[PDB]
């Protein structure tokens, strides 16, 4: 019951501190309430609290939105498209956190345009993962295969519009998939000759 007080008291305090945060930050309900729960558990059980694992990780900023965020990514590889999960090694232990999540091409093209080279997508084999990200919102930093503990990245709505650029042959290998025609429906063809 002493531990329970060291939790109810903490929550009663934190509600007053948190109220202006929810008033000014309506879109971050889940993160703020999770931080509240983490602080309550720290007060009750005495478990250590990691500052790096609980911090808002800025991905990209906006200045005026004019011109819109125009992200041209010619090397459309998974780390440069979806982002990176770089880890810290402490005593031979691979660890990660939210502050160690790195932006990709998608994460800084939001509210704007992501320009890719279609032949680049074909060469790197990230066309399938990119299609999944565009359809299901499945964007997630690539995890290198000798780190067992990763992060469960929640699906993220995509507010960008992807404009692929490539030689017509570079799209002959892509129009076979019906999902390409489902997603990309505007064919901006450049006539090879002018009158």
């Amino acid at each position: 019951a002493l531990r329970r007080l060291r939790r109810d008291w903490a929550l009663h305090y934190l509600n007053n501190r948190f109220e202006p945060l929810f008033q000014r930050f309506p879109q971050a309900r889940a993160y703020l309430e999770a931080l509240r729960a983490r602080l309550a558990r720290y007060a009750e059980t005495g478990e250590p609290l990691d500052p790096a694992q609980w911090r808002p990780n800025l991905l990209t900023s906006s200045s005026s939105g004019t011109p819109p965020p125009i992200v041209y990514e010619p090397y459309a590889t998974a780390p440069r498209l979806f982002g990176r999960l770089d880890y810290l090694v402490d005593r031979g232990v691979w660890s990660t956190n939210v502050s160690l999540i790195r932006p990709g091409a998608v994460h800084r093209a939001q509210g704007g345009y992501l320009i890719l080279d279609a032949l680049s997508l074909k060469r790197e084999g990230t066309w399938e993962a990119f299609k999944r990200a565009l359809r299901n919102g499945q964007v997630e930093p690539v995890t290198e295969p000798q780190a067992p503990a990763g992060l469960e990245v929640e699906p993220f709505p995509i507010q960008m519009q992807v404009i692929l650029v490539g030689t017509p042959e570079a799209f002959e290998g892509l129009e076979e998939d019906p999902a390409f025609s489902e997603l990309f429906r505007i064919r901006a063809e450049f006539s090879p000759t002018l009158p």
Binding site: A1, L2, L5, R6, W9, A10, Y13, R17, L21, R24, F25, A28, L35, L39, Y42, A43, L49, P51, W54, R55, P56, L58
Partner: protein
């Protein structure tokens, strides 16, 4: 940036979370709980006696 600053302040508030465990109201509540539990244990002790 405002969110980052607020989160840093909240993380710094763990010290005051520890401090409120020695607040006069908190100490009073803990003493009252201890007295109640010791009263129950003393009732059991008197029954055994």
């Amino acid at each position: 940036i405002h969110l980052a600053e607020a989160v840093e302040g909240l993380l710094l508030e763990v010290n005051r979370l520890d401090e409120l465990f020695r607040q006069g109201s908190f100490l009073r509540e803990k003493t009252q709980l201890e007295a109640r539990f010791k009263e129950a244990r003393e009732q059991q002790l008197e029954a055994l006696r």
